[PDB]
Design a protein around this ligand. Sequence first.
Ligand SMILES: O=c1cc(-c2ccccc2)nc2c(-c3ccccc3)c(C(F)(F)F)[nH]n12
Length: 274
Amino acid sequence: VFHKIRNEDLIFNESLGQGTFTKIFKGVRREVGDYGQLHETEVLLKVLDKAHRNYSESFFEAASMMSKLSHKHLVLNYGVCVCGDENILVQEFVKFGSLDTYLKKNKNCINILWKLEVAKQLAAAMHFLEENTLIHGNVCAKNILLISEEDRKTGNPPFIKLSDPGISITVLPKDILQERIPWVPPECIENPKNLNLATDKWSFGTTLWEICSGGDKPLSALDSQRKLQFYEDRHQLPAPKAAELANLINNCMDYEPDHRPSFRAIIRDLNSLF
Ligand SMILES: O=c1cc(-c2ccccc2)nc2c(-c3ccccc3)c(C(F)(F)F)[nH]n12
């Protein structure tokens, strides 16, 4: 059950973007924190569109299922806004935002060791989810947020967290799922009820391709009909020019779901590139 946050204690500021049927804002939460000290806390606010109240249950279930587990690489959910008739999730504000846009912005200052560390963190999170038999269902670089940049002064790697999947592919319109090829796997285009832990191993491979491609979007040049043809003809993504993770990517994007490797195996591969 979500903690209730008063709207009096939440200020909505700038729009950061949109998700599927949602708008996203930075804001400030006034809260009593540790030792009773009043704090002004940055928050990430996710507002379900008023025209899409039909999806409210899935919208909230997405955050609720992640919030029932605790992990260093999973975004913290703060609760929900007691916000009139609106449907609003309140979550941790991650300083440097989405990995996909960060990759693009800093394609100069990002080398393969940086990409490898982020891939290892993502695999660590998915391993945790796998052990908990918890399906995410929307792993993508947009949904990976950068807490802290590489700090050469201190040697510390970048650190990331994974945000919740949003409204599930099991209820979204077919055309949205097709637009999400190649993150949505072939068997889920066949039938979205095929959502499985193996879904996430496929989507991990797509996200790794995004990590290795400087924030390019795979298959962006293909319209939905052509994206379906990509799966019909059983193609694979092209090797990223930074090709060190090409094999791992194709191994995860296996058209047979049962053959996709465990995240234990995936972490082993990542750690053996050394
Ligand atoms: O915490 C944050 C922090 C920021 C953010 C955005 C811009 C600059 C610095 C941080 N940006 C997001 C997003 C986001 C926003 C627009 C499009 C996709 C993602 C998410 C979300 F949870 F929604 F994944 N959290 N987040």
